[PDB]
């Protein structure tokens, strides 16, 4: 075959619109998500929330290096305590767009041999029945675009309950963290350091 | 190659006549 100089008006617009549409998508998604605060509510509830977070981090952070100081905390603890839209919106709409404006062409030649049923779906524009395995219509180039475009976005540069009973649940975890795990540090540090830095 | 192509290197206008001959439309029919 001999396709004639439509490489300007389709292939470039297809890559170009994918580039702009995704860059816009990241800008739009970033715009849509705004917290701008936690809330504007009274003082107390965030205050005891961060107390709860202090307990939570004590589970991870402070529950390792406190062989002497483990028990001293626990008295205190008990007393003190007690996008899919981003997928759907752009790309489905532009499937309609491309089939609307770009149809009924053989746009290019993929380099690789597909199987016949790939050649079933891709050429809905053309109405030949034994054309070839390799040639493809316009919409196939889109089908290759969406899954291959992550390097482009990198290279241009872009990047990514009950109020009281749950307190009792973490008080039960305060009870659990007493002797569920007493971690072996401030005992093996001499062994570990002599094992290393030689 | 550098010299000849740099001389080349130093908008659409949709002209019909070259299109005809490239696709073989321009032909002589001997009857």
């Amino acid at each position: 075959l001999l396709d004639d100089q439509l490489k300007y008006w389709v292939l470039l617009p297809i890559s170009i619109v994918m580039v702009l549409t995704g860059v816009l998508k990241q800008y739009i998604m970033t715009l849509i998500t705004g917290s701008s605060a936690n809330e504007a509510q009274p003082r107390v509830k965030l205050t005891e929330w961060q107390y709860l977070q202090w307990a939570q981090l004590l589970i991870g952070n402070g529950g390792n290096l406190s062989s002497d100081a483990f028990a001293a905390k626990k008295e205190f603890l008990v007393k003190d305590l007690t996008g899919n839209m981003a997928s759907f919106i752009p790309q489905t709409i532009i499937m309609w767009w491309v089939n609307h404006f770009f149809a009924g062409f053989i746009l290019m030649q993929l380099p690789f041999p597909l199987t016949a049923k790939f050649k079933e779906m891709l050429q809905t524009g053309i109405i030949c029945q034994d054309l070839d395995v390799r040639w493809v219509s316009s919409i196939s180039w889109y089908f290759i675009s969406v899954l291959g475009l992550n390097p482009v976005y990198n290279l241009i540069g872009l990047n990514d309950p009950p109020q009281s009973q749950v307190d009792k649940a973490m008080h039960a975890m305060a009870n659990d963290l007493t002797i569920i795990q007493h971690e072996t540090c401030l005992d093996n540090v001499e062994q570990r350091v002599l094992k290393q830095y030689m | 190659r550098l010299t000849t192509n740099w001389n080349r290197l130093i908008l659409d206008a949709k002209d019909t006549t070259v299109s005809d001959l490239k696709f073989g439309f321009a032909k002589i029919l001997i009857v």
């Binding site: 001293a72 008295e75 041999p113 199987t115 016949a116 049923k117 079933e120 070839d132 | -």
Partner: protein
């Protein structure tokens, strides 16, 4: 330790009493593999299988019938 080393090299006895708050195993791979089974079985085997005879039509040999004759004619 411009000042901490200096404070350590000499002797210091500065302290007093203050209130101070008055503070007091191959299962994982066996498990995961069938999830590779399910897509190939259910959808890629919809119409997209190699090794069945319809995939070699591009590679099918060109039957040679005459190979020494022309049959020019009207």
């Amino acid at each position: 330790e411009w000042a901490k080393h200096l404070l350590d090299t000499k002797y210091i006895e500065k302290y007093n009493i203050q209130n101070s708050n008055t503070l007091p195993m191959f299962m994982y791979i066996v498990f995961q593999g069938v999830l590779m089974y399910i897509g190939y079985r259910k959808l890629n085997s919809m119409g997209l299988i190699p090794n069945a005879k319809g995939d070699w039509l591009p590679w099918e040999r060109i039957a040679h019938y005459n190979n020494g004759l022309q049959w020019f004619s009207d």
